[PDB]
């Protein structure tokens, strides 16, 4: 066990391809460790580092199956960087952007083609989108959502193609959790608002289905009491308070992968620094008490 | 603006000569910054750095008036190090000791001569005493309190001249806050016990008076739900829950300087990452909403 090498609190990101999972956790030296679920849990060790950022790096991960994985982290040079998987080994990606030293990161693949959005916080504390549509044009600026709380968590999810549907959750300068939305016709301010939350309260999103009845979105958020709670959206909506409620360590990040393998990853104190998996199976249960390298 | 350079959460240390205060706060690049109170608050800026540790460095600070100041921090190499003041300018101390990567620091002067104790957590997770008695002998290993919780906070306070009195507060492997005492005739387990507290809950001790009726000890500590509360010992005895109960950011540190200039420093989310001063004046009040560099 080298669970004590895991940060307290760690940056956490999670992806899945069917019942194959990956969880990316921050080591306390800035190392971004991969944990693998392939019918059992492995990795999280020093030889599972896919890159090194600064101590306290946020992690954001996104994928198209396991055909393409992209993991985002912040270096000690206050630049967001990118680790890449294209089926035959990890490599450094072209994504390099200056961020506020306290910036969080969100990232999404758009549809089943290799199209990427990354959301970071500028020095001026605005949320800026980064766009990759193809190699010819490379990384460009997309939308800037304006002033956000300095240090805000940033949580992004996408579903659909033609058009793509994107939601980005972050805190405004009055500590409210708000939502930036895109459905093909410009960015708007969404229906989701959690009033007057804790400064830099952690945020995690997942989504499943398509626009209409099948659609689901879950947004996991820190309460001022070191709980992680859940806002939920299904089909045509009405945001509501979901059943997920769990005690966490102060500052726990949270990451979610979607139904039908709905899992939520946080730090609740197990083995001190270890990450815990919660699983929806007609009700919340302990999916795995502590992730590798425990 | 400048206050956004302070870590979230930040190591905090405080000392005082009469009504002259010094507060040491960690910048989010590991910078150890000095705020000064000389009838008004100043400092906290980049040209007030006295030393640079790893991001999330703990800070311990101890003084004999303002004739002698010692400030302890952890470097990027997992070595606890010292910045010194002898009344003529800041220099690098001889104290360089290996520490677990997540180690805290407690440090005390013993009496009015130049005698120092530093408490750290070793790689094996034991609490280690470092002894400085004179130049002839230099830094030596002292007592070892055994297994502690990996990443425990460490708070240390001393009073008295001969015998010297030392109390060291830290978290055992069962998450209980416990006390190591020295009254001149060997170390013992003290009466202070705070059962099954949050793994690595912050800790801050001040003491005043002398063994006898005039003795004060105040131990500030973090609760599971982001309050800082207080354990109080007055002269003769009986630990009691103190009046001091404030809301904090997740993982806020706490530092305190003794009555009759009793002030508690913590991070409650004012200007996001600013340190707030509480004052004792027949009841707890706000003394300084936000410390420099804000
Ligand atoms: C062998 O390939 C496995 O699956 C890939 C999707 C990556 O997660 C890689 O780190 C892992 O070793
Ligand atoms: C081919 O380019 C690689 O993958 C693209 C989808 C981007 O993530 C890019 O930064 C990376 O270098
Ligand atoms: C049409 O409403 C938009 O899409 C839904 C899926 C929700 O994200 C809602 O808050 C948003 O405003
Ligand atoms: C049926 O309940 C709703 O959807 C489930 C998938 C869970 O997210 C639950 O917390 C939520 O209230
Ligand atoms: C049946 O296994 C459940 O689903 C897997 C895909 C993992 O999330 C595992 O930890 C969980 O117990
Ligand atoms: C004389 O040596 C200086 O003062 C002593 C009290 C110690 O703090 C030592 O590390 C420092 O270099
Ligand atoms: C006499 O009791 C000893 O000294 C007191 C000042 C307290 O620190 C107590 O916990 C300790 O065990
Ligand atoms: C009687 O009041 C006690 O001593 C004061 C000096 C404060 O520490 C207060 O919180 C404590 O309850
Ligand atoms: C006289 O003013 C009070 O005491 C000073 C020594 C400082 O603690 C100051 O911030 C506080 O308001």
Author numbering:
A (entry chain AAA), B (entry chain BBB): 2 to 295
What are the paper's exact sentences on this?
We finally demonstrated that SapL1 binds to bronchial epithelial cells in a fucose-dependent manner.
SapL1 was co-crystallized with α-methyl-fucoside and the structure of the complex was solved by molecular replacement at 2.3 Å resolution in the P21 space group using the coordinates of FleA (PDB code 4D4U34) as the search model. Due to divergence in the tandem repeat sequence forming each blade of the propeller, the six binding sites of SapL1 monomer are not equivalent, but they share important conserved features. Hydrophobic interactions are observed between the C6 of the fucose and at least three residues of the protein (mainly isoleucine, tryptophan/tyrosine and leucine). The O2 and O3 hydroxyls make strong hydrogen bonds with a conserved triad of amino acids consisting of an arginine, a glutamic acid and a tryptophan. The O2 hydroxyl seemed to be the most versatile position, since it established interactions with an adjacent loop only present in four of the six binding sites (BPs 2, 4, 5 and 6). The overall fold of SapL1 and FleA as well as the overall dimer are very similar with a rsmd of 1.2 and 1.26 Å, respectively.
